[PDB]
Structure 1
Amino acid sequence: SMTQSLREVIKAMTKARNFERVLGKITLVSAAPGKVICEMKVEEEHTNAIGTLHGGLTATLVDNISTMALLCTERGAPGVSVDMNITYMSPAKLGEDIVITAHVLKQGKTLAFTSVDLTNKATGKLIAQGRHTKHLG
């Protein structure tokens, strides 16, 4: 399964020394062609100085989970980031369960385009939305 494989990727991230370690707490909900859903509980390690989800972590989720969606395509190339944007619509608080849903919008010869929504698991309310363009080598 691409599900079995994405689980191994997440396991690898957890024990990493590099920056991939910061998402070690995420869990995989589903993988499908060009679509990945993960979930995460907001813990202290994920927060800023005021106890909400750090905007840089949100960016890191947008980046990594969209990259996972790209792994889940026929080409399966993760690429390198070219442009990313994130809009922050509601805070995510410590202890809240969040859902991160990534979709591939379009794949070309040298560029891929993805979108990510972070939502509150309980309410489905949008926390943030991001778009991420990657260059494929």
Structure 2
Amino acid sequence: TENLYFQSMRNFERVLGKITLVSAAPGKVICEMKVEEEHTNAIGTLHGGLTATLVDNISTMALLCTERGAPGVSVDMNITYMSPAKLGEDIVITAHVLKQGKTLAFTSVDLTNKATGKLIAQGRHTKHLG
């Protein structure tokens, strides 16, 4: 539903470009993006580092959608890469808040190929609140 325009940003979050926010519920966010040149590596696949940026941004969004408003600072992120996404493809980014304590929040993120429903990558992301 909502278009989001990170391209208007001047800091690093600008690398996401045009993403659409599909839904945002308590502790769950779904976004999509078409993979564009700006997102790719030389081989024309979603760049490992944009994947991480998505894991970082989209999980933060899910924590913004919590009863506590706080984005937190990263402590530990991990990502497993499973299949490539190609220039021109739509990916969907699904972030879940697994647990939110008073000091720590834990999130998970799947990127899936929208066409095949197959996971591109899964990230877990621990953040320190306050």
User: Which TM-score band (shorter chain)?
Assistant: over 0.9
The 4+ residue runs of structure 1 with deviation greater than 6 A are: none
RMSD of aligned Cα (Å): 0.9
Shift of 1:12: 6.2
Are 2:71 and 1:78 aligned? yes
The one-character-per-residue Cα deviations of 1:6-62 (angstroms, maximum 9, x if unpaired) are xxxxx4633111101011211100000000000000010000011100000000000
Distance 1:13 1:49 in 2: 22
Distance 2:27 2:120 in 1: 22
Higher helix proportion (structure 1 or 2) = 1
> What TM-score does the superposition give when structure 2 sets the normalisation length?
0.95
Identity of aligned residues (%): 95
Other structure's SS at 2:109 match: strand
Other structure's SS at 1:26 match: strand
Distance 1:76 1:65 in 2: 15
Shift of 1:123: 1.1
Distance 2:69 2:120 in 1: 28
Which residue does the alignment assign to 2:83?
Answer: 90
The one-character-per-residue Cα deviations of 1:77-131 (angstroms, maximum 9, x if unpaired) are 1000000000000000111100000000000111000000000101100000000
Higher strand proportion (structure 1 or 2) = 2
Distance 1:14 1:27 in 2: 13
Gap runs ≥5 in structure 2: none
Gap runs ≥5 in structure 1: 1-10
